[PDB]
Design an enzyme around this catalytic site. Structure first.
Site, PDB file in Angstrom:
ATOM      1  N   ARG A  36      49.932  56.433  44.124  1.00 20.66           N
ATOM      2  CA  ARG A  36      49.382  55.678  45.227  1.00 20.66           C
ATOM      3  C   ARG A  36      50.086  54.101  44.960  1.00 20.66           C
ATOM      4  O   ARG A  36      50.318  53.714  46.143  1.00 20.66           O
ATOM      5  CB  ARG A  36      47.863  55.434  45.181  1.00 20.66           C
ATOM      6  CG  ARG A  36      47.228  56.771  45.817  1.00 20.66           C
ATOM      7  CD  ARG A  36      47.675  57.419  46.977  1.00 20.66           C
ATOM      8  NE  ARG A  36      47.737  56.510  48.096  1.00 20.66           N
ATOM      9  CZ  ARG A  36      46.645  55.973  48.740  1.00 20.66           C
ATOM     10  NH1 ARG A  36      45.455  56.705  48.338  1.00 20.66           N
ATOM     11  NH2 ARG A  36      46.648  55.273  49.442  1.00 20.66           N
ATOM     12  N   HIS A  92      47.208  58.993  57.441  1.00 18.90           N
ATOM     13  CA  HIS A  92      47.107  58.289  56.250  1.00 18.90           C
ATOM     14  C   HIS A  92      48.568  58.573  55.397  1.00 18.90           C
ATOM     15  O   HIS A  92      48.625  59.192  54.535  1.00 18.90           O
ATOM     16  CB  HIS A  92      45.935  58.947  55.209  1.00 18.90           C
ATOM     17  CG  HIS A  92      45.630  58.517  54.029  1.00 18.90           C
ATOM     18  ND1 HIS A  92      46.145  56.951  53.908  1.00 18.90           N
ATOM     19  CD2 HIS A  92      44.736  58.586  52.997  1.00 18.90           C
ATOM     20  CE1 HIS A  92      45.291  56.726  52.668  1.00 18.90           C
ATOM     21  NE2 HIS A  92      44.588  57.803  52.279  1.00 18.90           N
ATOM     22  N   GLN A 126      49.584  57.810  51.513  1.00 20.30           N
ATOM     23  CA  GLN A 126      48.928  58.871  50.571  1.00 20.30           C
ATOM     24  C   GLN A 126      49.738  59.870  50.503  1.00 20.30           C
ATOM     25  O   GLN A 126      50.157  60.661  49.499  1.00 20.30           O
ATOM     26  CB  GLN A 126      47.482  59.429  51.201  1.00 20.30           C
ATOM     27  CG  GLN A 126      47.065  60.741  50.337  1.00 20.30           C
ATOM     28  CD  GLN A 126      46.561  60.220  49.199  1.00 20.30           C
ATOM     29  OE1 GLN A 126      45.849  59.399  49.376  1.00 20.30           O
ATOM     30  NE2 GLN A 126      47.193  60.803  48.034  1.00 20.30           N
ATOM     31  N   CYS A 184      43.613  64.204  47.450  1.00 21.23           N
ATOM     32  CA  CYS A 184      43.744  62.764  47.850  1.00 21.23           C
ATOM     33  C   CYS A 184      42.768  62.023  47.210  1.00 21.23           C
ATOM     34  O   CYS A 184      43.200  60.767  46.861  1.00 21.23           O
ATOM     35  CB  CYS A 184      43.996  62.461  49.237  1.00 21.23           C
ATOM     36  SG  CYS A 184      42.744  63.159  50.134  1.00 21.23           S
ATOM     37  N   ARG A 210      42.782  49.375  56.919  1.00 21.62           N
ATOM     38  CA  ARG A 210      42.296  50.621  56.977  1.00 21.62           C
ATOM     39  C   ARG A 210      40.986  50.476  57.590  1.00 21.62           C
ATOM     40  O   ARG A 210      40.310  49.552  57.804  1.00 21.62           O
ATOM     41  CB  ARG A 210      41.698  50.896  55.460  1.00 21.62           C
ATOM     42  CG  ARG A 210      40.596  52.246  55.401  1.00 21.62           C
ATOM     43  CD  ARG A 210      40.283  52.349  54.046  1.00 21.62           C
ATOM     44  NE  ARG A 210      41.253  53.232  53.320  1.00 21.62           N
ATOM     45  CZ  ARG A 210      41.101  54.398  52.656  1.00 21.62           C
ATOM     46  NH1 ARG A 210      40.002  54.541  52.060  1.00 21.62           N
ATOM     47  NH2 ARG A 210      42.333  54.903  52.198  1.00 21.62           N
ATOM     48  N   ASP A 220      40.746  68.381  50.445  1.00 21.36           N
ATOM     49  CA  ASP A 220      40.093  67.171  50.719  1.00 21.36           C
ATOM     50  C   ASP A 220      38.820  67.386  51.186  1.00 21.36           C
ATOM     51  O   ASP A 220      38.441  68.660  51.352  1.00 21.36           O
ATOM     52  CB  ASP A 220      41.014  66.434  51.882  1.00 21.36           C
ATOM     53  CG  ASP A 220      40.434  64.799  52.066  1.00 21.36           C
ATOM     54  OD1 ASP A 220      39.617  64.211  51.367  1.00 21.36           O
ATOM     55  OD2 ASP A 220      40.833  64.691  53.159  1.00 21.36           O
TER      56      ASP A 220
HETATM   57  C1  LIG Z   1      41.334  59.139  51.402  1.00 21.51           C
HETATM   58  C2  LIG Z   1      40.185  59.556  52.179  1.00 21.51           C
HETATM   59  C3  LIG Z   1      40.650  60.805  53.139  1.00 21.51           C
HETATM   60  C4  LIG Z   1      39.572  61.575  53.865  1.00 21.51           C
HETATM   61  N1  LIG Z   1      40.037  62.302  55.108  1.00 21.51           N
HETATM   62  C5  LIG Z   1      38.730  60.509  54.649  1.00 21.51           C
HETATM   63  O1  LIG Z   1      38.988  60.021  55.927  1.00 21.51           O
HETATM   64  O2  LIG Z   1      37.631  60.392  54.442  1.00 21.51           O
HETATM   65 CL   LIG Z   2      51.357  59.655  59.028  1.00 18.76          CL
END
Ligand SMILES: CCC[C@H](N)C(=O)O
Ligand SMILES: [Cl-]
Ligand SMILES: CCC[C@H](N)C(=O)O
Ligand SMILES: CCC[C@H](N)C(=O)O
Ligand SMILES: [Cl-]
Ligand SMILES: [Cl-]
Ligand SMILES: [Cl-]
Ligand SMILES: [Cl-]
Ligand SMILES: [Cl-]
Lengths: 334, 335, 333
Positions: free
Chosen positions: C320, C135, C138, C275, C108, C233
């Site tokens: 998840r 992501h 997710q 999310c 990550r 989000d």
């Molecule tokens: C799971 C976190 C998702 C958010 N768009 C981020 O990148 O902070």
């Molecule tokens: Cl993707």
């Protein structure tokens, strides 16, 4: 008893009866013997545990980890940074998410209200690994240690004094525990730092039912006379401002545990306890800074006491693990 | 096995604490454990053991090697990183040692002065393993010697000639010199005289080497130092914990000791292999390497990309061998 | 698909077919059943996994840990500091070293290019646990959750809207996934934050093959009309500068998911997804500071919605773990 503890949280000793606390201590002793004998049965096989720390820790975190490992569980350590907790995600949300994935959760941090909210929302056992107000697992280990070093007394027969800052988490918890178990506790320190009035009244109410005694005093000789154990802790706790040292060193210095204090017990077999970490010399960055500013060598305890044959602090530290294991086994085990 | 018996419950603080035959034993055990993992036949000798890993400096290989070695052997681990614990600010090492010693079966420490690891090793009451200090890096050299044996087609260590280039008084230079003396090797430390190892350490290693038939050469001259070498070894010129002001003063001093293809050719050995403990600055793909190399208009520092990515480079075999050799240390001392 | 998934990286949904993604979803459901029944068999016994995190995480890290533990694997967490990554050691070198010791690697962090480099060099399966751009794990969890809450509909039968910052990792991945699975997705937000045109074009090409529909619109009323699910989000993502809040609150606040937005769907059975982590009240430091400054109670979603009977965010969060488990089992088992 066991059945009555499965799925319980462990947030504070006020939440537990005298007999539940004795049960946990007895279980701790049984698990200790089993580990030493090589006969430990794994009652947490396949369980996954989350360990949330918002303050630093050596004993508590390690105790959780090793206890879990020995019992067949796996652990995730969520340290003061690296997760979404607090800045980006509420505790109600964190509790519900972790409760979906984990079988039990430890929390160390700030206000008792936070741990109580975790405990109410997670849906799995939550254990308090220290909060500003209370430190329940520490006192279990302390009582196991007192029983081990008393060679056949019950807790209710033991006399002990806690010196210094009596209103910190450890002082609060010792008082509650002593009350629950019928002990004779003296809190010996400046009156400005005695425990909260309502907590004292609650514990005195408990003590009258168990045969316990709770003495508050500023007088060292009177407070420590005939004690089996002397206990102390740092005068400024995690999360507090270092400006507190300026406010407290003058008030607490008469309550330093030094050899004269041990001599005032009149008890040649007096044992010294400390929850740790301790400031007893200049071998820490903070202890050295404070000691230098105030012209001291050791703060709450001197090196001479801390390293003496009267000191049982490393036995007490080991017992953190055995007692944390008992809490997890009772609340989560098979 | 006598070596196995004498190794139980020992610390692993530095190679100066082990006999020649003990060190050989740990190398031999590493090879056996490597073969076992690859064959799918590894037995879990550390089942139920718990290990604490204290890191006061950053790590990729050593941390990971300790974790995977423990996991493979049935042990569990606790990582206690640069912060989050009470160590140093709130609790002395002597106290930390005694507390960890009550809960864990063994403890790794990576950090600063050797004196700290020695204190931990004295006070803990369980095996303490040095995962790097300012002065020594013992587990690295076990890996290095297993790697040299794997790449030497039947030669013993006592038959191998090698040069270490650059900062000869850093932990890895110190340790290579002790290990070479122990094992009867011919080692050349090749670098500026100001960065040669401590005279007391050299004298101790010369005494060790006289009984094993080892040879220790200190020289500033690269062409004479590398002639005939089976292996060429280097490491970064400024180590963790040193002031980064040292880059300005050291790059130009150390640049003649860069391992590049001309240096490999100066060995006169078509089979020469290149080794580096890692991490390495060989291109512009790190923040520190890029900033320091750009300051001097260089592409790579202690080793070029051309050498590092060549068929002569065995650095990733050497990296893998960190795990198998840490496994041997833990199995020997706790198994 | 079994033969086809062994040893694969999981770097982005664009790398997988419709049938592979459905297989992973089905496997997640089977693994979820097995854990609930107590019949789970350990297919990762003896495997060691490295988890690299250059950004913070609660769900993703915990999911990878619990999934591995349940499957008999062990894990090493390599957090934003403590390793040699980036300052001292290149990702090509990191990849190669970790590949020698571990059986699989999670990453990550920041650019998708970094995860691609790790997946090209490690020699073992590499899984993307979030990057600036994508992501993927997710979205697996999200589609499992939709299927659970849709009363027998297939994904190709579902209509949903994502509100707010459409060009963040989660918006990007929902559009890709919707395209792959033949869904009708509306990305509903300000046009300055619509997804990259090249990605939209790629997703439209995919959608033509699967019967999916991709709509970009600034209109909330029309965008949410008839949707089965509404998704949002945070408006400012990890690694973005906090100064972004001042730009984005004014552009994004019309896209807040509040009870009036649910009403505009016309669907009494609409469900709400997020999310997480979410800013829905003043019980976080960032959420309180931003909302107080702007005179709001909740940012991308209100409390009333988030804690409502329509909200399925904790089911989604649980999922998840079961979906990450599937990715690991499919690629390493
Ligand atoms: C799971 C976190 C998702 C958010 N768009 C981020 O990148 O902070
Ligand atoms: Cl993707
Ligand atoms: C274990 C630490 C206890 C101390 N009173 C503190 O809260 O810092
Ligand atoms: C493995 C790192 C070795 C290097 N000499 C250092 O101390 O930074
Ligand atoms: Cl308590
Ligand atoms: Cl004294
Ligand atoms: Cl050494
Ligand atoms: Cl070159
Ligand atoms: Cl609302």
């Amino acid at each position: 008893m066991a059945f009555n503890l499965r799925n319980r949280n462990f947030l504070k000793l006020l939440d537990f009866s005298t007999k539940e606390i004795q049960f946990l201590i007895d279980l701790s002793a049984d698990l200790k013997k089993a580990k030493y004998a090589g006969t430990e049965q794994k009652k947490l096989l396949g369980k996954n545990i989350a360990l949330i720390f918002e303050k630093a820790s050596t004993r508590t975190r390690c105790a959780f980890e090793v206890a879990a490992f020995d019992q067949g569980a796996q652990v995730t350590y969520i340290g003061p940074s690296g997760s979404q907790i607090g800045d980006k995600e509420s505790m109600k949300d964190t509790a519900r998410v972790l409760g979906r994935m984990y079988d039990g959760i430890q929390y160390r941090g700030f206000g008792q209200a936070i741990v109580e909210e975790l405990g109410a929302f997670a849906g799995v056992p939550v254990w308090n690994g220290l909060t500003d107000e209370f430190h329940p697992t520490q006192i279990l280990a302390d009582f196991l240690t007192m029983l081990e070093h008393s060679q056949g007394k019950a807790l209710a027969d033991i006399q002990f004094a806690y010196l210094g800052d009596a209103r910190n988490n450890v002082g609060n918890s010792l008082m509650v525990g002593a009350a629950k178990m019928g002990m004779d506790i003296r809190l010996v320190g400046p009156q400005a730092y005695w425990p909260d009035e309502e907590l004292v009244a609650a514990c005195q109410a408990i003590a009258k039912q168990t045969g316990g005694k709770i003495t508050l005093t500023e007088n060292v000789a009177e407070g420590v006379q005939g004690c089996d154990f002397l206990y102390t802790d740092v005068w400024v706790s995690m999360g507090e401002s270092p400006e507190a040292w300026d406010e407290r060193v003058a008030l607490m210095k008469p309550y330093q545990v030094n050899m004269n204090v041990l001599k005032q017990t009149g008890n040649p077999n007096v044992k010294f306890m400390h929850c740790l970490p301790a400031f007893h010399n200049d071998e820490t960055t903070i202890g050295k800074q404070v000691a230098d500013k105030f012209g001291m060598k050791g703060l709450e305890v001197t090196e001479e006491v801390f390293e003496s044959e009267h000191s049982i602090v490393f036995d007490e530290a080991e017992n953190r693990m055995h007692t944390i294991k008992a809490v997890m086994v009772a609340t989560l085990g098979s």
